[PDB]
Design a protein around this ligand. Structure first.
Ligand SMILES: [Cu+2]
Ligand SMILES: [Cu+2]
Ligand SMILES: [Cu+2]
Ligand SMILES: [Cu+2]
Ligand SMILES: [Cu+2]
Ligand SMILES: [Cu+2]
Ligand SMILES: [Cu+2]
Ligand SMILES: [Cu+2]
Ligand SMILES: [Cu+2]
Ligand SMILES: [Cu+2]
Ligand SMILES: [Cu+2]
Ligand SMILES: [Cu+2]
Ligand SMILES: [Cu+2]
Ligand SMILES: [Cu+2]
Lengths: 409, 309, 409
């Protein structure tokens, strides 16, 4: 078989679960003395760890409380309506994701609005642990770790100032990850950068690794395991000699917040009040301790907005033209007119042509919703013949500040 | 012998096959409204996908129609005279690469003249599919994809302007990769950048992956599969619910043209005239549709030279 | 029946080995016409390949003959005292690492002083081959290769001028790696860069690869195998047609030193006097040939130091204050005022607070051992109440040139 694989299995006792995740802007500490603006689910980076069992029925209420468009994209098997691309969730709006957990493993979830690197770099990612139904994982002390890239001064910097483990740079140096001599330990590790890959390395012991976080796989033994961005790994290890050790991504990341200290204790006694019974029956979850510490260190200051979705009326003078530019840098809200001419007039029967002069995809979408371009790729055009008189107000469904009008005579 | 491996197997019915590849300089569209100079085999980037069966006697006639020296280096087993490092093929010249296909799997070919990274960056790379002799791969709809790095202003820029799938950035956004609900699909994916690696990710389903494109291996299951530059992967997936999904390299690549739409259809009938019977007996190749679209979008204009010596 | 693996096995005839490694500064040639300053073990980059068997008793006497702090961190299983993080080895001091080789495989050793990226970029890394005790690997001609990043003008540059195989860029273009037609060949490959990963590719044959260099694993077949930084791979291949071939990292690395010629010989006769009987019984080691060539090409000019004792901080003035800054960039020894103020005066009962205003971890540590901060992360603080009059000389245990004084009356 394996004896170490967990084949896909029909859960005889599925449960029905629900979560509420809110897209929220905040100011958090990301390093000692470094406060930065972030885009979150529920106020921390990373977002909450979701944990349930293979076969469970899961519903996530998603609320957008920001002036950007956002989604939730979950890794793993589901259908198009629940894949987090279609539709974009607009400021002030809500969406319900729903799925039966089709397979066990370690997955992630993150925003899929455009440009996606910007939304992930600002903080919109989290961990999703799906426990196997055929049998529980071996009894272990369990921790989770996101590996990310963060720069407080330029979100999209190729090389970021920080490569935090769980959002706050260096947190596990002052607050070591505690393990118990001779006790199996399991790390749920999520790679979620955009540029460099992550060689995940732990000192002084050999890792057992499920590749891609998929429990159907035979695991393998590693001193270092390369986790690609958008991949995960379930890792088990045992330390047998009390003392201090390290784990870290192996590379320049380890000087920039991707390093953690491991404290090997002689027994589990000092942990009995901090650990929690795991959804893997017989295991000991430290995830609650971790998320408590993430919130303590980050000290989030939530930002609340009034009149989300409301915007002034276009009052620009109408131009007789059949060609419209989608303006360069429109993915920045600071560009106050995103189409040019923002208001056009044409005769009945006229084909109007939009050119995307930005470097990011945009759309042209009637909100009375009589026409819709879909994605218009950077540099490409989209055309439509207007055969019905009236005024049509249109938007970009990716960037809610983006609007225009066309008057057909 | 695990039911999912394909061991080396002497083909009982080998064929003798031949291809002609011409190094050609060209101007192509690499993105909407972006024309760039490229170095190609046969006028497009990527070069033609070569496909034959394990055990076949393969001959590739390489003709150099540029003012620069070029070679073709194939991945896989062969001898030094057929390895595309020595000799250099000079302008005007022809060189016949010849080998028996020793291993099934997914390989690549590309120029190996100095500096090799520059020649690859300029476009001189393609895909080589070698179908297994012991038995066909499972019946599936088949597509190929190269993952590359392209900058029209500085061929050796560290972070390139584009990270296209099959050479033209974003082409599968306007022309989705069509799959059929419940039908096995197989992706032949080639990693051929030079700086960053490629975490290849498909929305809404779990990948069955043959590491390194080598069919001797037991496959494994992945949500994302890291493809190193110079490596390949044969990937199988099934989508059961109709609608639109995505796949892409997971990273900054996906903001720069590494992004494709997957359209899951409930019936195949609109694909009947587009697909071709595969060299994997029982499968349906969409490779020809892909290469028609690449040429349609790139609109190549050759740079024809007179001297060549 | 998984007879392609080498199970962990209790060696019935362990040997006792003792090695001596000395941290030594040097200038070496790293490419034709390019001399550069390096930090070494025993005068070359890479450091000497250590090779022994699973279960052997291994002692490594380490001597620091430089004005920096250094350690040796070994990959593989050992305890905290032998993990090369605690303690730092100060200039002119020595430490005896000792461990029983707990598992076979291909490992690595390197300095773990801080920032580690700088010490590895400067050249403090080597290879450690631990041969299996259950049975020898298949008889083969054996080579080792480190894949590193080196820039002679800015050690920490993201994209380095060179990516050498075994330290000296391009050495195997003029000195081909010789293999024998039909004879199994085994490469011990170590990935030890810090920024980019290494897709290791060999021409004209398909490799058999033990992932992560762990022989407990079933191997797999690859045309290219991605080696993460801090990871290794044991690779086996057989060329059957005489002539010239290549191997290299597949990437921009290949034009910057990461390329090697392979010469497939008709038979082994011309290698009989350079090869050596391998610690894998039945194999032929070429490692000694490689390390002779590394030294010949690098032409190391070593720098010895005899007086590396600590001495006290040098200051012209003393400030009556109870706050001290750990100054930005003090991890560079050119910055001469590492603590500000260097020398302070306080009354007994005063609590002194240090703030780390650098981007690197630092410590505040008495030369005796009255007080010690441990790691102080960038932007954090550490305080100590001095209740008894006296004179105190403190340093950073990570960066020995950082020195200050406290006068308590
Ligand atoms: Cu978002
Ligand atoms: Cu280590
Ligand atoms: Cu993702
Ligand atoms: Cu370390
Ligand atoms: Cu838009
Ligand atoms: Cu060429
Ligand atoms: Cu996804
Ligand atoms: Cu190649
Ligand atoms: Cu996606
Ligand atoms: Cu050092
Ligand atoms: Cu090759
Ligand atoms: Cu290491
Ligand atoms: Cu090559
Ligand atoms: Cu210091």
């Amino acid at each position: 078989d394996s004896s170490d694989t967990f084949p896909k299995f029909k859960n005889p006792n599925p449960q029905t679960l629900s979560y509420t995740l809110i897209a929220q802007d905040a100011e958090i500490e990301v390093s000692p003395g470094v406060r930065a603006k972030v885009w979150t689910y529920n106020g921390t980076v990373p977002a909450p760890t979701l944990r349930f069992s293979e076969g469970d029925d899961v519903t996530v209420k998603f609320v957008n409380d920001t002036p950007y468009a956002h989604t939730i994209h979950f890794h793993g098997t589901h259908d198009s309506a629940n894949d987090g691309v279609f539709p974009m969730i607009m400021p002030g709006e809500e969406y319900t994701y729903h799925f039966v957990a089709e397979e066990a493993g370690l997955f992630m979830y993150h925003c899929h609005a455009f440009p996606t690197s910007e939304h992930v770099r600002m903080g919109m990612f989290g961990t999703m642990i799906i426990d196997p139904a055929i049998r529980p994982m071996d009894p272990a002390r369990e921790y989770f770790f996101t590996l990310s890239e963060f720069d407080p001064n330029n979100a999209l910097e190729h090389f970021t100032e920080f490569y935090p483990i769980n959002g706050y740079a260096g947190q596990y140096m002052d607050n070591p990850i505690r393990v118990v001599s001779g006790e199996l330990t399991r790390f749920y590790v999520v790679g979620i950068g955009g540029v460099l890959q992550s060689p995940f390395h732990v000192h002084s012991t050999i890792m057992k690794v499920y590749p891609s976080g998929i429990l159907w796989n035979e695991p393998y033994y590693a001193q270092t395991h390369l986790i690609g961005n958008g991949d995960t790994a379930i890792i088990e290890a045992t330390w047998t000699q009390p003392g201090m050790y390290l784990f870290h991504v192996h590379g320049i990341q380890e000087e920039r917040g991707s390093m953690a200290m491991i404290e090997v204790l002689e027994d589990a006694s000092s942990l009995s009040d901090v650990q929690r019974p795991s959804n893997n029956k017989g295991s000991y979850s430290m995830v609650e301790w971790q998320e408590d510490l993430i919130r303590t260190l980050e000290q989030p200051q939530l930002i609340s907005y009034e009149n989300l979705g409301e915007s002034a009326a276009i009052s620009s003078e109408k131009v007789s033209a059949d060609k419209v530019s989608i303006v360069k840098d429109s993915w920045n809200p600071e560009i106050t007119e995103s189409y040019d001419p923002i208001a056009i007039q044409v005769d009945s029967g006229t084909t109007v042509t939009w050119t995307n002069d930005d470097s990011v995809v945009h759309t042209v979408t009637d909100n009375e919703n009589s026409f819709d371009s879909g994605f218009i790729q950077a540099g490409n055009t989209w055309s439509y013949s207007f055969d019905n008189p009236g005024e049509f107000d249109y938007i970009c469904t990716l960037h809610p500040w983006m609007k225009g009008t066309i008057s057909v005579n | 012998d695990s039911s999912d491996t394909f061991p080396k197997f002497k083909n009982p019915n080998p064929q003798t096959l031949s291809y002609t590849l011409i190094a050609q300089d060209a101007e192509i569209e690499v993105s909407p409204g972006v024309r760039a100079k490229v170095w190609t085999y046969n006028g497009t980037v990527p070069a033609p996908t070569l496909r034959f069966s394990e055990g076949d006697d393969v001959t590739v006639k390489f003709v150099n129609d540029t003012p620069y020296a070029h070679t073709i280096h194939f991945h896989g087993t062969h001898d030094s005279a057929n390895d595309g490092v020595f000799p250099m093929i000079m302008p005007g010249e022809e060189y016949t690469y010849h080998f028996v296909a020793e291993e099934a799997g997914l390989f690549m070919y590309h120029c190996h003249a100095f500096p090799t990274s520059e020649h690859v960056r300029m476009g001189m790379f393609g895909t080589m599919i070698i179908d297994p002799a012991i038995r066909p791969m499972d019946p599936a709809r088949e597509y190929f994809f190269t993952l590359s790095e392209f900058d029209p202003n500085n061929a050796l820029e560290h972070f390139t302007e584009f990270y296209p799938i099959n050479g033209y950035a974003g082409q599968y956004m306007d022309n989705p990769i069509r799959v059929v609900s419940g039908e096995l699909t197989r992706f032949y994916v080639v990693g051929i950048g030079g700086v960053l690696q490629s975490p290849f990710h498909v929305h809404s389903t779990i990948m069955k992956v043959y590491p390194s494109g080598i069919l001797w291996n037991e496959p494994y299951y992945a949500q994302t599969h890291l493809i190193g530059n110079g490596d390949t992967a044969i990937i199988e997936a099934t989508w059961t619910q109709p609608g639109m999904y995505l796949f892409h390299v997971h990273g900054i690549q996906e903001e720069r043209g590494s992004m494709a739409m997957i359209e899951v259809l409930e019936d195949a009938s609109s694909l009947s005239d587009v697909q071709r019977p595969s060299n994997n007996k029982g499968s349906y190749s969409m490779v020809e549709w892909q290469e028609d679209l690449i040429r349609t979008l790139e609109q190549p204009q050759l740079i024809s030279y007179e001297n060549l010596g």
